[PDB]
């Protein structure tokens, strides 16, 4: 839903990586999001009992 | 071919305030709620300005 | 007829920019305007306590 | 024995896409590179492509 102004191409965040970027062909703004999400955990019991 | 307008070389100037004007999109990029520093040659606030 | 101009000069100077949600620039602020702009450039905040 | 922290969740690429502007024309590679009289040091010629 972001409108760039005619002369931009390009959006950064507060970290300046990308965040939104214009299709050079049809002219419609998109996002960027990143693909690695979310914290991963392991419970074991002990490698020697099971 | 020009026929000089005036003889009075110069009047003496008289400045007033430039209050928080003159500020220029730095970079072709967009931001949404960031507050951003950037230096380049800009106009002092509060300057005075014939 | 009446018209005015006026005549301003650029100098090298550091400004904080504050970004609207629709990508305007509504604020901005001189670091060197006196010791509160300047904090308020260091602090990174519009409004100091 | 205990509960352990590893990495986080990754996705892996599955396709790969190029979006460049829709440009048809070759750009003057033969009257830059090869054209018959160049420019002088002092009076260079610049050209836009
Ligand atoms: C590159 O190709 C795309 C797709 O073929 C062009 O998109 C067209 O844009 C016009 C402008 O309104 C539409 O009327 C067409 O319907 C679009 N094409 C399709 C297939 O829907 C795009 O314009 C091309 N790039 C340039 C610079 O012309
Ligand atoms: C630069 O111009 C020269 C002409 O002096 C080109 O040389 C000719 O190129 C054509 C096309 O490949 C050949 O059929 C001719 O045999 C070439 N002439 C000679 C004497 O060999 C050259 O191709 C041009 N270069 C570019 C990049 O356009
Ligand atoms: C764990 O396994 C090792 C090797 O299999 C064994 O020597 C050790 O006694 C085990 N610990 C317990 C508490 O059984
Ligand atoms: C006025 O214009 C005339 C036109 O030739 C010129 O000779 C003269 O020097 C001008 N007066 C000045 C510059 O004071
Ligand atoms: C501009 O300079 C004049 C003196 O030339 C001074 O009186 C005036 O206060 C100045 N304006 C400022 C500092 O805004």
């Known amino acids: 839903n972001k409108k760039f102004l005619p002369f931009q191409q390009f959006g950064r965040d507060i970290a300046d990586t990308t965040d939104a970027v214009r299709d050079p062909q049809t002219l419609e703004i998109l996002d960027i999001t990143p693909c690695s999400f979310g914290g991963v955990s392991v419970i074991t019991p002990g490698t020697n009992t099971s | 071919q020009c026929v000089n307008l005036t003889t009075r070389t110069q009047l003496p100037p008289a400045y007033t305030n430039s209050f928080t004007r003159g500020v220029y999109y730095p970079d072709k990029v967009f931001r949404s709620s960031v507050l951003h520093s950037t230096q380049d040659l800009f106009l002092p606030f509060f300057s005075n300005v014939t | ?49 | 024995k205990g509960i352990y922290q590893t990495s986080n969740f990754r996705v892996q690429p599955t396709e790969s896409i190029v979006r460049f502007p829709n440009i048809t024309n070759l750009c003057p590679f033969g009257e830059v590179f090869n054209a018959t009289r160049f420019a002088s040091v002092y009076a260079w010629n610049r050209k836009r492509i």
């Open chain 3, 1 to 49: 007829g009446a018209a005015a101009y006026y005549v301003g000069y650029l100098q090298p100077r550091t400004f904080l920019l504050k970004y609207n949600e629709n990508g305007t620039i509504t604020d901005a602020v001189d670091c060197a305007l006196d010791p509160l702009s300047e904090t308020k450039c260091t602090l990174k905040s519009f409004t100091v306590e």
